[PDB]
Ligand binder design. Structure first.
Ligand SMILES: NC(=O)C1=CN([C@@H]2O[C@H](COP(=O)(O)OP(=O)(O)OC[C@H]3O[C@@H](n4cnc5c(N)ncnc54)[C@H](OP(=O)(O)O)[C@@H]3O)[C@@H](O)[C@H]2O)C=CC1
Ligand code: SF4
Ligand code: SF4
Ligand SMILES: [Zn+2]
Lengths: 176, 95, 126, 208, 48, 111, 96, 114, 287, 376
């Protein structure tokens, strides 16, 4: 099925040619364009006064790169290295040791926030859901030294809030 | 549980704190070292030793699909408590 | 159109752009890769991998990473025979070593031999 | 079988089989392989001394029009006397069929430069020269597009490693942007993932 | 939060002066919100 | 007709007889081409059947119903192009047997 | 909007497309969040008692491509396909 | 072994085309050092041009010499046009060390240069 | 000695070299080229700035990832200077202003600054301290500037014995003071000998001395390879540029050689003349 | 700045207010896409196919996923096919409205750009509610669509359909019936059918100049054969005609969205195969084989049988082709992309052989360039 465009002919009737002549010599369609633009003038513009009104979102945003921990407990990661294996720019870096207990843990857990391209593959991949793409997007950093997060940075960034993260996960653990 | 180092810098949960021959001290000049304040080692003694009377029990982690996968741990040692590898919290049996 | 053709060597190394330092300084190593011994399967065999000998890998002082000034230390090629490996190594200019293939030797085992009468080949447990 | 298995249609398989034996009948000077995959697209594997005759034939002849040109890539397979493969990828406008002319070549001997008969081939050919190094004899314009002007190495080979030999930085000693050998910040740790146990049984090559 | 305004101008925050002793009468930042109201304010829910 | 659907294709005033003398020229130049090649036989078959399509109809609309190449001059243009490859294929002698064989460890894939 | 009659009349007069109806300031289909917890159904998998994986073993069915001629009067010359039918002007307001 | 070379038949056309290309580079350099507002004397540039010719001197095959003629012709065309910039011409030179000599002693103090 | 101080392979762009360098000043000229050559060497450079962060923002990115570091300092106290030399392998005094201000004259920059930093450097455990000075800055006349540099040389010679006192002659480059003053004037000429030396020869000599041990305590002075007439030099500058007050006494008075003390070739770096680099650097004439 | 709309280093050699010839020096936006995918796996190197065209955020994902499915012998389930078709039409709508608005801002014409970018902001909000990303939502894995849409979205797309039909008719009110915009693009951009078929043109040029051609009608790679639409055809090969072609393809994309919503079946999300698609969380946390297939599927990558394939979708630029080369492994051996933007930039001389510089600005504007795709 094909519906082509631009196949008319100029009708040589007096009415059609004097309408096209009025269009030419009387600037009518240009006035029509001005009418359309003023019709959008007298509306109310959909702006938001920014630092008071933040924008809308979804409960599945990808932001801050926080870590979680067990209820009234210790860390949730294991250093199972799946997130370093699936990080598509390989920004994850994990060096792992066990501590004085015997349970396996880490030493060093690094995200390059430069090389992080915010897929969510480490959100889908982590079996204990230890790393979560955080909720907020306000990084705005002066130097290049700060943008290389450490494990203690991610723990203090997960300790800065979990109530947000827990509410969003309980909203959306059923889909993914 | 920070350690009174001669440098005075805060130690971490991992024993990585510096010496007097380290210039990474002088790159910490004027920029306060953010260390974790709530550790991970001592938060096991804060949790009581649970007592479940059966022999071989099941651990999930506080709710379905939020936590670690099902791990079926054994309690056959007479003097050593059980320990889930994922959780970290112990279990004992009640005869 | 029935042209010049003559049987001589090939010298692509002046065309491929890589500098003389990496032409003369490193040494290729061509081998059949042995099995990762914990698993037991030979699909990772049946090729001819070419690798380059590694060089310095210092510590990045800011993160403890491994910054290396080695552009060629992460190339590994998969071939199908040793003669094409030698021909490519001489064609593309650099030197090479040939670690020869060592296939598993066939042996002869049987459960009836495991349960003999006077012979000491005996499992003694099953 | 019936759910979640992409079903094949043997009609296109049989018609392209007949068309392939037809082509091998009518151009016996250059044909080596005529192979048909399971998803029914034709692959004609050709010596590089009949590029101009095969394309001048396959543009016309009213049993297969094939006006449209696409991808040309000379996919570098080593362990061969001829490394590179020119892949012409031709499309009809009347017939809705896709054929892949895979002609082979090496690093040095020129292919016949199809730009005289397919006008789309000009920047495709310039790209293959700038990335691989397959020279094109009797071709008007060979320059560098997609690489820097002070750059050489033909980077899409396998013999060009992933990082570069040159890397730019600005310096104020000469007030300009100068090129230095590469000094990375991280290793690009390459993970071995060629796992054994032969994930496909039908493609077992004959051993010795 | 008003219901006569549209989606984006529903909910807004008014900050006080010297909340952390920083003379924030002027120059209001982002992330001067506590996180529960950060869930409320991006319209991630329908409940305060 | 009047102002066909394509762009750089101005309408034809003599479809039939122009195409008829075209196909006689096709058969003529094909008659120069040697015999035992398959190319002569298949070109002869398709060209004589296309000409017998045309010679049996003085129509235009029924010509488009019976013969493809919509609408009209595209058959003419493709006819001129097949004449062009025929004039090329007096040269290049494609029915001669193969130029030299591949190195025989090449085309098989799994490397 | 939410305003007087004269300016709304000038808005309708500058473009007669009933501006108060569809005005791109939405107030009503702000979606009512905290939805009930959705159950995601599963179709023709996880059914017990018949799901031999060898039956629907679609990865293994990829045959190597069949080979016709190499280097190692027959009434013929078919095309790769039938000629595709010429289309039609659609009914949904064509031109002309 | 069936090989069709690019332009030549033996090294005689190779020597002919490379002496023509060197003549082109010799008369094309002072125009560029006028145009790009460089920092280099003319004879220093000519000496590094003949250095770049002398670098590839150990090549015997006719195809490789013809392909080098092609490469040099392409870059001479892109330098007589103004399509390249001051970065590229300085990239041909070396005024940013790279200071490491070929001494075994200096390759002993600086680590791991066999 | 301690790890992360040992060298590593090649040089530059997070190729870690041995030194940890604390450089004073560096918002001006010679410190900026020295920071650039250390970033080409690839070491960690501590620079204190009293000034705006924007000037060191424009001379900032020559260091690699987290290599250079910033702090604040003044010429009144010792706490910020001790904070600068908390951990420093080598340290260089490159300070000075060529015109007196309100808060500081030529007095007490050259007097007050090197006393405190030489004191806290000898105390806080640094090695191979390098101090610049001007050539032929003596007790002799016509320059409060040069007699104050002689006072500073006396102090830096007396306290902290194991230094490297160094002095170049009048140096020229892309942001030179006196050569731009020659181009930007309005004019008369006498007979006055003068040797200028290009700036990168001086800074190659400085970094070779800063990485080289067992040549320390020996003071140095730098040599122009031509050493010719002032008025011929003004003629040559106006010729290449196409056109036909303590500073003006300093440039008119004297610039002589001193055969007492070693120079360039006793350290092993090639000198570059004025004429080649002057054709290189004299842009900004008409059109 | 702006007359490149991005970066193209134009070298136009001209007799005055006219031409002689020109070369678009392109490749300044080179990023090493094929090399990086050669050193990665399938699932890991999916975002390169998300962003080699950086506007059509779902179509090129669909193209890569159809190449993997076409090689892998897996039919995707029905509801995934319908969601993929719905977002194909939404992505087509977004890409054509960007093409018209950047043509307008390149030629002058400040405000209609802004009306339609407020509409495009609404559609970015819909992509965010679906995935989370603003623009580069990966979201289309091979083997069906992953992490299906949350409850409460179709009504929003319905509301947008009504509002957007009114807004695009007001754009026709604004721009189409203009005197000097018509005078600005009528005379230029002749395309002969010979040139359109030899110079490798793809998509909207072929529609707008002569030949009846559509991948969606001819070779339906999915369920496009069950909806009522009709592709516009050109009349003279003109940028005013091509503008009308783009606006009516937007209108037909609205109709395909309407019929797709009124014929949406609630089947299932992903394939019936835990060897390609990952198992979901419930069976993951309580199974054994699901945890095994999760772990090896994300570490190793699923294996892909050896073979060389090619496919092409109808991206809003044109015949977006992708050519896979698969050694029997979990890494693709060599991939390459047929770019309609690249083949269109190859015909720049034949479009602007006899014109002036503002005509060259209109020629670059009238063909939807991104130059992330002209590079490959
Ligand atoms: N021919 C020459 O140029 C010669 C130069 N030198 C030395 O070379 C160096 C650079 O030369 P030049 O450009 O002329 O000097 P500069 O003024 O450029 O370099 C000195 C730097 O230290 C800063 N500084 C100096 N005194 C003070 C102070 N009291 N308080 C705070 N900051 C101070 C300067 O200004 P700020 O505070 O704004 O950063 C500047 O950053 C100087 O140390 C000079 O003595 C010596 C002999 C010859
Ligand atoms: S995937 Fe999760 S558990 Fe595994 S190493 Fe990463 S954060 Fe830790
Ligand atoms: S979201 Fe960031 S850290 Fe996670 S896998 Fe992607 S790039 Fe890596
Ligand atoms: Zn547990």
């Amino acid at each position: 099925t094909y519906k082509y465009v631009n196949l008319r002919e100029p009708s040589m009737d007096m009415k059609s040619v004097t309408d096209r002549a009025a269009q030419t010599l009387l600037w009518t369609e240009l006035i029509r364009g001005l009418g359309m633009t003023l019709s959008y003038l007298f509306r109310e513009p959909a702006t938001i006064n920014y630092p008071f009104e933040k924008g809308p979102l979804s409960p599945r945003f990808r932001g801050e790169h926080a870590l979680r921990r067990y209820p009234s407990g210790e860390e949730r990661c294991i250093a199972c290295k799946l997130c370093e294996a699936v990080c598509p720019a390989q920004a994850i870096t994990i060096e792992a040791e066990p501590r004085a207990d015997g349970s396996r843990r880490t030493t060093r857990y690094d995200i390059d926030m430069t090389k992080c391209i915010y897929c969510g593959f480490c959100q889908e991949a982590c079996p204990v859901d230890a790393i979560v793409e955080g909720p907020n997007f306000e990084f705005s950093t002066e130097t290049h030294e700060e943008l290389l997060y450490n494990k203690e940075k991610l723990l203090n960034n997960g300790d800065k809030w979990e109530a947000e993260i827990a509410a969003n996960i309980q909203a959306d653990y059923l889909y993914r | 549980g920070v350690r009174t180092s001669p440098t005075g810098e805060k130690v971490t949960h991992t024993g990585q704190v510096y010496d007097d021959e380290d210039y990474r001290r002088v790159r910490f000049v004027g920029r306060q070292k953010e260390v974790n304040e709530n550790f991970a080692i001592d938060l096991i003694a804060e949790q009581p030793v649970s007592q479940v009377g059966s022999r071989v029990i099941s651990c999930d982690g506080g709710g379905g699909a939020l936590g670690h996968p099902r791990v079926y741990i054994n309690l056959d040692k007479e003097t050593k408590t059980g320990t889930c590898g994922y959780c970290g919290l112990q279990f004992r049996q009640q005869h | 159109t029935q042209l010049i053709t003559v049987d001589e060597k090939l010298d692509i190394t002046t065309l491929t752009g890589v500098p003389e330092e990496h032409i003369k300084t490193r040494k290729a190593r061509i081998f059949v890769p042995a099995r990762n011994n914990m698993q037991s399967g030979v699909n990772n065999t049946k090729k001819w991998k070419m690798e380059f000998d590694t060089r310095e890998r210092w510590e990045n002082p800011l993160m403890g990473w491994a910054s290396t000034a080695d552009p060629l230390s992460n190339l590994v090629l998969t071939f199908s025979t040793k003669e094409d490996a030698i021909a490519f190594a001489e064609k593309n200019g650099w030197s090479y070593d040939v670690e020869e293939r060592k296939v598993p030797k066939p042996k002869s085992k049987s459960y009836g031999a495991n349960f003999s009468w006077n012979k000491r080949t005996r499992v003694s447990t099953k | 079988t019936r759910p979640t298995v992409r079903p094949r249609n043997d009609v296109a398989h049989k018609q392209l089989s007949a068309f392939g034996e037809y082509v091998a009948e009518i151009l016996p000077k250059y044909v080596q392989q005529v192979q048909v995959s399971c998803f029914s697209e034709l692959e004609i594997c050709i010596h590089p001394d009949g590029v101009i005759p095969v394309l001048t034939f396959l543009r016309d002849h009213s049993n297969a029009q094939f006006k449209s040109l696409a991808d040309l890539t000379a996919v570098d397979i080593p362990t061969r006397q001829n490394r590179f493969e020119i892949v012409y990828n031709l499309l009809s406008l009347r017939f809705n069929s896709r054929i892949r002319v895979k002609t082979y070549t090496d690093e040095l001997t020129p292919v016949e430069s199809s730009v005289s008969v397919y006008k789309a081939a000009n920047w495709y050919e310039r790209e293959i020269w700038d990335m691989f190094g397959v020279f094109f004899a009797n071709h008007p314009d060979l320059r560098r597009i997609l690489t820097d002007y002070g750059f050489e190495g033909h980077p899409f080979r396998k013999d060009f490693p992933l990082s570069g030999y040159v890397e730019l930085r600005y310096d104020d000693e000469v007030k300009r942007v100068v090129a230095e050998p590469v000094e990375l910040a991280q290793e690009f740790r390459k993970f071995d993932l060629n796992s054994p146990w032969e994930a496909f049984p039908a493609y077992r090559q004959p051993p010795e | 939060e008003d219901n006569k305004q549209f989606f984006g101008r529903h909910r807004w925050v008014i900050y006080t002066t010297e909340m952390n002793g920083k003379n924030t009468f002027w120059d209001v930042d982002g992330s001067m919100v506590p996180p529960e109201w950060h869930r409320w304010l991006h319209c991630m829910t329908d409940d305060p | 007709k009047k102002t066909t659907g394509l762009v750089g294709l101005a309408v034809c005033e003599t479809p039939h007889e122009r195409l008829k003398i075209l196909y006689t020229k096709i058969l003529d130049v094909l008659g120069h081409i040697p015999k035992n090649a398959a190319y002569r036989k298949y070109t002869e078959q398709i060209t004589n059947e296309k000409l017998s399509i045309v010679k049996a109809e003085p129509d235009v609309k029924k010509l488009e119903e019976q013969l493809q190449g919509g609408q009209i001059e595209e058959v003419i243009l493709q006819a001129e192009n097949e004449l062009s490859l025929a004039r090329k294929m007096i040269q290049w002698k494609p029915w001669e047997p193969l130029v030299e064989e591949p190195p025989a460890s090449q085309w098989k894939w799994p490397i | 909007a939410s305003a007087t009659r004269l300016i709304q009349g000038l808005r309708n007069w500058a473009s007669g497309r009933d501006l108060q109806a569809k005005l791109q300031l939405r107030y009503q289909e702000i979606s009512k969040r905290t939805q009930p917890p959705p159950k995601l159904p599963v179709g023709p998998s996880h059914r017990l008692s018949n799901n031999y994986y060898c039956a629907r073993d679609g990865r293994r069915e990829a045959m190597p491509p069949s080979i016709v001629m190499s280097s190692q009067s027959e009434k013929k010359a078919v095309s790769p396909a039938p000629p595709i039918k010429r289309w039609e002007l659609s009914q949904d307001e064509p031109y002309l | 072994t069936s090989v069709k070379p690019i332009f030549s038949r033996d090294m005689n056309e190779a020597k002919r085309r490379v002496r023509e290309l060197y003549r082109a580079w010799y008369r094309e350099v002072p125009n560029t050092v006028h145009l790009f507002q460089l920092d280099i004397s003319v004879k220093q540039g000519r000496d590094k041009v003949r250095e770049m010719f002398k670098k590839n001197a150990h090549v015997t095959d006719p195809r490789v010499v013809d392909l080098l003629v092609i490469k040099g012709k392409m870059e001479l065309e892109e330098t007589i046009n103004v399509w390249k910039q001051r970065t590229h011409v300085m990239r041909f030179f070396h005024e940013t060390e790279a200071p490491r000599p070929k001494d075994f002693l200096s390759k002993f103090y600086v680590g791991h240069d066999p | 000695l301690h790890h992360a101080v040992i060298p590593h392979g090649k040089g530059g762009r997070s190729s870690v070299s041995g030194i940890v360098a604390t450089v004073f000043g560096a918002t001006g000229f010679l410190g900026r080229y020295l920071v650039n050559h250390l970033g080409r060497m690839g070491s960690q450079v501590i620079v204190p700035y009293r000034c705006e962060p924007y000037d060191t923002m424009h001379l900032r990115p020559m260091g690699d990832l987290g290599q250079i570091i910033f702090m604040d300092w003044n010429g009144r106290d010792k706490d910020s200077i001790r904070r600068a030399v908390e951990h420093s392998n080598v340290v260089i005094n490159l300070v000075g202003r060529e015109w007196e201000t309100k808060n500081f004259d030529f007095e007490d920059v050259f007097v007050k600054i090197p006393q405190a930093i030489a004191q806290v450097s000898k105390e806080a455990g640094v090695e191979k301290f390098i101090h610049i000075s001007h050539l032929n800055a003596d007790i002799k006349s016509s320059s409060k500037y040069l007699r104050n540099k002689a006072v500073g040389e006396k102090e830096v010679r007396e306290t902290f014995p194991e230094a490297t006192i160094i002095k170049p002659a009048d140096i020229f480059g892309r942001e030179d003071r006196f050569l731009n003053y020659f181009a930007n004037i309005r004019s008369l000429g006498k007979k006055t000998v003068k040797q200028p030396v290009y700036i990168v020869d001086v800074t190659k000599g400085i970094i070779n001395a800063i990485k080289d041990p067992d040549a320390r305590g020996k003071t140095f002075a730098f040599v122009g390879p031509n050493r010719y007439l002032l008025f011929d030099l003004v003629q040559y500058v106006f010729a290449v540029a196409h056109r036909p007050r303590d500073k003006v006494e300093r440039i008119h008075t004297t610039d002589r050689t001193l055969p007492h003390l070693p120079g360039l070739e006793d350290l092993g770096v090639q000198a570059t003349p004025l004429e080649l680099k002057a054709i290189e650097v004299l842009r900004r004439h008409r059109t | 700045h702006p007359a490149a709309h991005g970066v193209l280093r134009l070298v136009m050699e001209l007799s005055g207010e006219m031409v002689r010839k020109c070369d678009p020096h392109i490749g300044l936006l080179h990023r090493g896409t094929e090399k990086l995918i050669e050193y990665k796996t399938y699932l890991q190197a999916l975002p390169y196919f998300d962003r080699l065209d950086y506007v059509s955020m779902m179509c090129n994902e669909q193209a890569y996923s159809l190449a993997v499915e076409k090689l892998l012998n897996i039919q995707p389930p029905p509801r995934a096919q319908w969601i993929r078709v719905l977002f194909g039409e939404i992505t087509r709508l977004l890409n054509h409205i960007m093409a018209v608005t950047t043509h307008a801002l390149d030629i002058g014409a400040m405000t209609p750009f802004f009306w339609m970018f407020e509409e495009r902001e609404k559609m970015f909000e819909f992509y965010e509610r679906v995935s989370g990303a603003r623009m580069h939502a990966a979201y289309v894995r091979p083997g069906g669509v992953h992490q299906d849409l949350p409850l409460g979205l179709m009504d929003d797309i319905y509301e947008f359909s009504k509002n957007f039909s009114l807004r695009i008719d007001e754009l026709e009110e604004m721009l189409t019936n203009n005197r000097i915009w018509r005078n600005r693009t009528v005379d230029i951009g002749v395309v002969t059918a010979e040139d359109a078929l030899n110079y490798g043109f793809s998509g909207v040029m072929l529609r707008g100049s002569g030949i009846q051609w559509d991948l969606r009608k001819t070779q339906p790679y999915d369920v496009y054969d069950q909806v009522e639409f009709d592709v516009p055809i050109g009349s003279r090969g003109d940028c005013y005609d091509r503008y009308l072609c783009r606006v009516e393809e937007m209108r037909q994309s609205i109709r395909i969205i309407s019929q797709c919503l009124n014929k949406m079946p609630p089947g299932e999300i992903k394939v019936d195969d835990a060897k390609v698609s990952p198992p979901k969380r419930a069976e993951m946390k309580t199974s054994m084989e699901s945890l095994i297939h999760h772990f090896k599927l994300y570490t190793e990558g699923y294996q892909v049988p050896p073979g060389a394939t090619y496919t092409a979708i109808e991206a809003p630029k044109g015949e977006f082709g992708v050519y896979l080369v698969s050694d029997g492994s979990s890494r693709p051996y060599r991939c390459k992309i047929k770019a309609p933007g690249f083949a269109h930039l190859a015909g720049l001389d034949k479009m602007s052989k006899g014109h002036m510089l503002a005509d060259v600005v209109a020629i670059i504007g009238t063909q939807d360039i991104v130059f992330g795709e002209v590079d490959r």
